[PDB]
Design a protein around this ligand. Sequence first.
Ligand SMILES: CC(=O)N[C@@H]1[C@@H](O[C@@H]2O[C@H](CO)[C@H](O)[C@H](O)[C@H]2O)[C@H](O)[C@@H](CO)O[C@H]1O
Length: 138
Amino acid sequence: PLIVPYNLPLPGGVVPRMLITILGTVKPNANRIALDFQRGNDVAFHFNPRFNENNRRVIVCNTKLDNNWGREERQSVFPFESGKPFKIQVLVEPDHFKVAVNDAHLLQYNHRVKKLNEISKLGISGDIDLTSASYTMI
Ligand SMILES: CC(=O)N[C@@H]1[C@@H](O[C@@H]2O[C@H](CO)[C@H](O)[C@H](O)[C@H]2O)[C@H](O)[C@@H](CO)O[C@H]1O
C-alpha cells in the first residue's frame, strides 16, 4: 500500500471538527510509530507510540519549537499490538487534538501551537504498513 514515511498535506491547515483517519497494520517486532503534525519546521503535535522503552510500552506526546522538544506528555495506556491492524482517529477540537484508537478514546493534547491554520501537513512514519490516510469534516 502507501509509502512510509508518508506526507499528508492538510490544505489550509487544521481547523476544529477536522477528522484525520489513519488505517494501518503494525509490523512484527515494531519499535516505534510517529504522527507529526507540522507547522513549517516546527512539530505542533508529535504522537509517538514506543514499543520498547525500558521494556515498557508508552505513548509519548510533545511539541517541537525552533528545533527544541518541550515537556513530554505520556500515556501508558497502549492500544497498539505488533502484527495487528489499527485505526487512529485524530479529531481537531478548539483547544485539543483528540485521539482515538480502534474507536476508543485514548488521549487529549492541548494546543501549544496556537496558529492552527498554519499546521498544514501530517507526517506519518515508523514500523507500520500504511493502508490509508485521509481527512474529512464532521
Ligand atoms: C533528542 C532526544 O533524544 N531526546 C530524548 C527523548 O527522545 C526524543 O523524544 C521526542 C519527543 O519528546 C521525540 O520522540 C524524538 O524522536 C526522541 O528522540 C526521550 O523521550 C527523553 C526521555 O527519555 O529523553 C530525551 O533526552
